[PDB]
Amino acid sequence: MQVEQRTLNTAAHPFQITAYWLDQISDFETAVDYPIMIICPGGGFTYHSGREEAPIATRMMAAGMHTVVLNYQLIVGDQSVYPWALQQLGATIDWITTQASAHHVDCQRIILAGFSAGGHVVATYNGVATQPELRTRYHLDHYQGQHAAIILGYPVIDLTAGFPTTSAARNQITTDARLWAAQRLVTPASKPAFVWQTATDESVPPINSLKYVQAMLQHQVATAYHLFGSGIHGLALANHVTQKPGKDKYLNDQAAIWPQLALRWLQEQGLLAGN
Amino acid sequence: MQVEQRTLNTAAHPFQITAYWLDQISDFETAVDYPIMIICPGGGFTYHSGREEAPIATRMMAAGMHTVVLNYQLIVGDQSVYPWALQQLGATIDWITTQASAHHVDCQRIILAGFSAGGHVVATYNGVATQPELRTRYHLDHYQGQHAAIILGYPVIDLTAGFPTTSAARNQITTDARLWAAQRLVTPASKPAFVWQTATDESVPPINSLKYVQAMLQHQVATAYHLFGSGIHGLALANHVTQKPGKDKYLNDQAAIWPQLALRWLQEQGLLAGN
Amino acid sequence: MQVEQRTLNTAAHPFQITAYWLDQISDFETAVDYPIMIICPGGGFTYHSGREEAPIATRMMAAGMHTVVLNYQLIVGDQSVYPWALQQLGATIDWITTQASAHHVDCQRIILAGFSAGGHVVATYNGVATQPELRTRYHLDHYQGQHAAIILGYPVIDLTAGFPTTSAARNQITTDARLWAAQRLVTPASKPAFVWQTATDESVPPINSLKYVQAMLQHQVATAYHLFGSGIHGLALANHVTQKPGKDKYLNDQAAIWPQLALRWLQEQGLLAGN
Amino acid sequence: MQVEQRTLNTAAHPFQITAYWLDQISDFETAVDYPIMIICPGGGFTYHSGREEAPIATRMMAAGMHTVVLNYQLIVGDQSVYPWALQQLGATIDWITTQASAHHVDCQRIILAGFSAGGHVVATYNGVATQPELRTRYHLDHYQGQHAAIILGYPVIDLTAGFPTTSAARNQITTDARLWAAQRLVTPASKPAFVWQTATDESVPPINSLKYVQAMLQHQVATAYHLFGSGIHGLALANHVTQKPGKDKYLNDQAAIWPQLALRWLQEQGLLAGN
Q: What is each CA distance from A104 to A25, A36, A90, in whole angstroms?
């Protein structure tokens, strides 16, 4: 295993990634290409949450995949999140294709994962990047590679659906209303999505994920949806690993099965080797 | 364990039930009252599917509850399903209260489970029976007892949403359109619901379950929802037990976890003893 | 599902069984034959423990098999357990063969399950019934049918190994010392065994199960062995179902997985339909 | 996450380790000390198997622990494995104590894990390091820190029990017959052990792990033992991750649950945070 932290410069706003590369197993006689998961953590568009980075990356890596954590564009200085964050996702996927030979990456198995605010970036990208008119509009032309599926954990989906709490805050994320509601960008070309959230989510109302899932069904895109009946927002792994010290509310044994469900779903989609 | 099969006549249309009663464990120094689940199987309102009767009842009994299979009103012989089926559910719950001392039934833990067409009866009942005006409208007066929660497996929810396929068939089930869409009968008084379906369901579109769950959320009623990514309609246990001989399409190892999920959800609701 | 309770008289000491028969699923276009498990509960040879009867039978039935609870010979009324108990097992298997057509029993999939004291009867039977000389010695002549495998939960294996506590009690169970140590009756003809116990068992020392498994290995008989690290003797299902009211020591979530393990092992042996 | 590869020099034979350090989660308000697992892979004492290094480390790290892979002494040049490998384990634990403050390591939760040949090193260390006379004999005096438990996967336990196949090969490992049989070094001071193997193991007969478990029980040391009924030697994770390409025999879905069992066992032992 190797860790690589660097700046990628192939976007209008350069940005940092942290890649965790699997090394080839030495007593294997033939090389193996592995899937790769790009992770966009939460943080309300003002920070990148550590709880939704390495702990999640490490769990996915244990199942035999490379991971890359993307420091997508935040509200910082006078800058909004969009359109920049969408171009950075495209640039990261393109960079992966250039690294694929060196690190044994299966470019037909690039998965995107977004949590809370990072889920808006990923859910929006799923719609934008799979539609030529929108790729051009948001300057995604001339990037190589494409993702094969997305995973969304308690995602922000529609900026008018409860998160954020004010119009001023919404506008800071983007004044481009075409990007407020990711469910409205779904077409039959959108990639398959595994979506999970808790029904008791207060800060990002579960109507968010429900609306995205509804739009996916209505456009005949393969999707799985797990709305657990309890738990606060921001559970992450929902176990002791991502538990804020002394806070029981970050533990939910029902929701904690989601990585297993997600990995099995990836296997069903033929995007991860089965066993 | 005891099996009791009989006709109940305390409804305009008499009907058959099959009760599977738990016996007390003789080692125990004190008697214990157990929850009870009423099961309404599928069958498109033209029969009662055996795949969704004893196999499901037995799995639930293994977790320490009594079960009752309800042969609800069908359209055979040019009959309507409603309002008769609601009265029969009411009468089954009532009969259960009269059997509580004899069988150690905990009447604060009566659970309703509906599959496909049976899910329409249960979901509709969840709204109707919890609203005094509707109880009077549909003649549930003088029926004792109430259920505490429902479980719905690939349920028919809205008779205009894909099942059945024609206006004639919809109206045959009932010409009373206030009863067509169970999601519209949801109020804060509805009991909590565990709901599951497959996203690829081609007989009753998944929008059915999604709409019901949306309404539950919008009325602040506790709910959990598992929309598995793959699998045909009518999986039942989704394993070898309910598999039609030689038909692999009735097997889905991901969906097969639903009973464990439902049982753990019941425990969380305080409706089944915990571990 | 049907419950049948009756006395079998085809042994020197008549005895009671309780059979729980699966009914055919009417939806199925073809009939199917199911495996059947004979359960011998614990009770220290002075009673038959209900905690190890219906609760265990029901869990096994949920996986698609018939079950029979066997009230094997006890020492009450100054009786010995052997050789009578062996004949009663033989006679139960024989009776099962006569019921095969009536109940769709697959007689190539008869499984024996023994708990604690019941485990001694089953383990001993596994050696005795598979050896022509011992079948003649203990009068199993003219009994039809044979079992295909055994399951043992915290079994008494060797009457000199901690249970019972005195020579008098050991000899009361049987003055025939060739029957004291079931591990010594193991030959390559013994049927495959799934064995589990807790390492902290203080009533029947875990050396009991360990010795049996060692002998199975040494005679090239397929075996699996799960010695859980914690938990008292007599956990049964190790969950709320078999928990003595208010006694937390009967709960062990790690040991509670044993039925799933045993069922998956049966599938691997080709003795239960797979998924 | 940080990777550190270096030589440790505090032993007669210096040696390499590879440490995978968890970083502190940035949005946590208070620091958290994490357990650490030292892994000794297999390789028949002639190499260090890659299949039993990073893939296993990564799985344990996903559960919230640091890991260190130990390149213990191999048969190389004219050198035997012992006594050197035992001193290198002591030196690694001592080095961990010196790093504990910097990396937030809980020194009361140092776990040792050994696979096949590496299991002999760990099982022998468990006995040697917990007995003052033997610590002195094997030059382990004046090292700081101690392990709290061990995990053994299909371990070589007794060098006379089938692995290796010749006396010449055994002697190359060590001519010190006091160290041939790790079960004979067990005392009540040995640390708790989680042990797993397959019953069908051909290259390291399962009598190995059975003998170690038997000795632990007989000296009242807490132990758990899982002898799965099928699978070849060297399964590692027993899933697609450690599967040699195109070889189904490295897949065993039953044995693949061992990491989950091991982690839960560590939690029961109070050696890993619960959830």
A: 12, 10, 20
8 A C-beta contact, residue A261 and residue A226? yes
Q: For B99-206, where are the alpha helices, taking DSSP H only?
A: 100-103, 117-128, 132-137, 167-173
Q: DSSP letter string over A61-80? A: HTTS-EEEEE----SBTTB-
Q: How was this structure determined?
A: X-ray
Q: Do chains A and D touch (3 or more CB pairs under 8 A)?
A: yes
Q: For residues A218 and A221, give the distance between their C-alpha atoms in angstroms, rounded to a whole number.
A: 8
List subunits contacting chain D, requiring 3 or more Cβ pairs under 8 Å.
Answer: A, C
- Whether C contacts A, i.e. 3 or more CB pairs less than 8 A apart, is no
Alpha-carbon gap, residue B23 to B46, rounded angstroms: 34
How far apart are the C-alpha atoms of C179 and C123, rounded to whole Å?
10
Residues contributing to the annotated binding site of A for Ca(2+): 33
- What CA–CA distance (Å, rounded) separates B125 from B70? 14
**CB-based contact (8 Å) between D251 and chain C?**
no
CB under 8 Å to D146, separation ≥6 — which residues?
A: D93, D110, D129, D130
Q: CA-to-CA distance for B242 and B224, rounded, in angstroms?
A: 24
For A51, name the nearest residue in chain D, comparing CA atoms only.
D25
Placement of tokens 């598979």 in the chain: C130
**How far from the centroid of its chain's Cα atoms is residue A269's Cα?**
17
Distance of CA B264 to the CA centre of its chain: 17
> Å from B65 to nearest chain C CA?
9
| Angstroms from A119 CA to nearest CA on chain B | 19
CA-nearest residue of chain A to D244?
A28
Exposed/middle/buried for residue C33 (C-beta within 10 Å: 0-12, 13-18, 19+): middle
* Cα–Cα dist B90/B260, whole Å: 28
Taking the C-alpha atoms of B154, B160, B164 and B169 in order, what is their torsion angle to the nearest 10 degrees? 150
Q: Are D245 and A22 a contacting pair at CB < 8 A?
A: no
Q: Which CATH number fits domain C1-275: 3.40.1180.10, 3.30.1240.10, 3.90.230.10, 3.40.50.1820?
A: 3.40.50.1820
Q: Is C225 exposed, middle or buried (0-12, 13-18, 19+ CB in 10 A)?
A: buried
Domain ranges of chain A: 1-275
- Residues of C within the annotated binding site? 33
Please state the φ and ψ torsions of residue D36, each to the nearest 5 degrees: -140, 140
Q: What is the spatial distance between Cα A18 and Cα A56, in angstroms, rounded to a whole number?
A: 13
Counting Cα atoms < 13 Å in the Cβ hemisphere of A58 gives: 30
On whether B33 is known to bind a ligand per the annotation, the reply is: yes
Helix axes D258-268, D54-61, angle to 10 degrees: 50
Going by DSSP bridges, is the β-strand pair A2-8/A15-21 parallel, antiparallel, or unpaired? antiparallel
Cα B7 to Cα B76: distance, rounded to the nearest angstrom: 18
In the block, tokens 């948001």 appear at A138
Give how far Cα A217 sits from Cα of A221, B195, B198, B252, C20, Å. 6, 17, 11, 20, 44
Q: What angle do CA C251, A260, A187 make, to 5 degrees?
A: 140
Q: What is the dihedral of CA B82, B88, B94, B95, to 10 degrees?
A: 180
CB contact at 8 A, C210 and D217: yes
- Name which of C245, C202, C244, C210 is nearest C227 in CA terms: C210
Please name the residues between 168 and 197 in chain B that touch chain A, using a CB distance below 8 Å.
192, 194
- Cross-chain CB nearest to D62 (options A30, A62, A244): A62
